[model samples]
Target: GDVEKGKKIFIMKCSQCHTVEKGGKHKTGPNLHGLFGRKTGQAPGFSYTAANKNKGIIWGEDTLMEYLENPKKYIPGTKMIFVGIKKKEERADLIAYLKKATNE
Candidate 1:
């Protein structure tokens, strides 16, 4: 899908909590700048739950997709409360936008 289209979804669905620009300020969720290679819940200057901090999971396209599909089920103690993206195309589009947006 189009990056702009995915960006729209992210803006509406995620911008309230996260930031996608590089070195962006964090809100309820951590800034998503350069997220692909980072450790889960390891964003600097942010306080993460113990469950998230200790997740020990790496972020990649596939992992992010799974997590987006079901945050609570993927990481039982995660602080995120959204129901999650249920549409496959939406997930793909969002992941597409995230790959480009979060990775320099």
Candidate 2:
């Protein structure tokens, strides 16, 4: 996965609702800082739906790949409205970028 390509994809597709910088404010979606290894719906101050709160997912490359491909399918009744990424490589790239950005 290419971090550059993933950053581009994130800027185009995810930046509207999410912020990956440390301590970034939550937008329509929760802030994504420290995303990896965190439980789903754990972002403080973000109101998550029941489905998301109960999903008990640990975010990681494998889980993110599946979730990013089809979020509704991965966690039914989630509040997220964006249609998921369809291309496998793009998902991989996005994950790679997120791994770096969210942890920074």
Candidate 3:
């Protein structure tokens, strides 16, 4: 997977609120620093929706891909308004970036 392309997606699509790392306050969403593998309902400081709280989920590859593909379908009531990337390759690449983001 190409991290560069994922970074581009991060900028074009996900950058309005989410950050690859932390330096700013929540902008309608939480800082995404170190989000992969993180437990559900555990992004820190921000309040969670009740549906979000019931998540015994984690940001692993498959889960993230599913959510990225269709957040409302994967996790009903999720606040994510993303319409989703249709390309499988792009989703894979983006999830790969999330997986490796911690070491960056």
Candidate 4:
């Protein structure tokens, strides 16, 4: 699933706001450890806006791919400011990386 490529993509794109390790310090965003099974707006101490809150989402590859493509469309009132990756492969790679790391 190109996990290595995914890691590089995350480093360049999402690392500034997130940490993928358990108990990692929260940055602008939340620590993404164990993100796969987590609900929206439930990242430790992070406070998400309404569009992202209590959405009853269990993060999965399909859902995350859509959200990462266009967060505004995915959750209208959310506050994530990323512009989103335009390439499908890149997004797939990223989700693969997320799944891989969290599974371990």
From the highest TM-score down, the ranking of the candidates is 2, 1, 4, 3
TM-score of 3: 0.88
Q: Which ten residues in a row have the lowest lDDT in candidate 1?
A: 1-10
Query: Residue-wise lDDT of candidate 2 within 1-84, one digit each (tens)?
Result: 899999999999999999999889999999999889999989889999999999998999999999999999999999899899
Overall lDDT per candidate, in order of appearance: 0.88, 0.95, 0.77, 0.85
Give the winner by lDDT.
Answer: 2
Clashes of 2: 0
* Pairs with backbone N, CA or C atoms under 3 Å apart (clashes), candidate 2: none
TM-score of each: 0.94, 0.97, 0.88, 0.92
Give the winner by lDDT: 3 or 4.
4
- For candidate 4, lDDT tens digit of each residue in 41-100? 887788778778856687888889889998887887778898888889999999999998
Question: What's the lDDT of the predicted structure labeled candidate 4?
Answer: 0.85
**Residue 10 displacement (Å), model 3:** 0.9
- Stretches of candidate 4 exceeding 4 Å from the true structure: none
Best by TM-score: 2
Task: Locate the minimum summed-lDDT window of 10 residues in model 3.
Answer: 17-26
RMSD values, in order shown: 1.1, 0.6, 1.6, 1.2
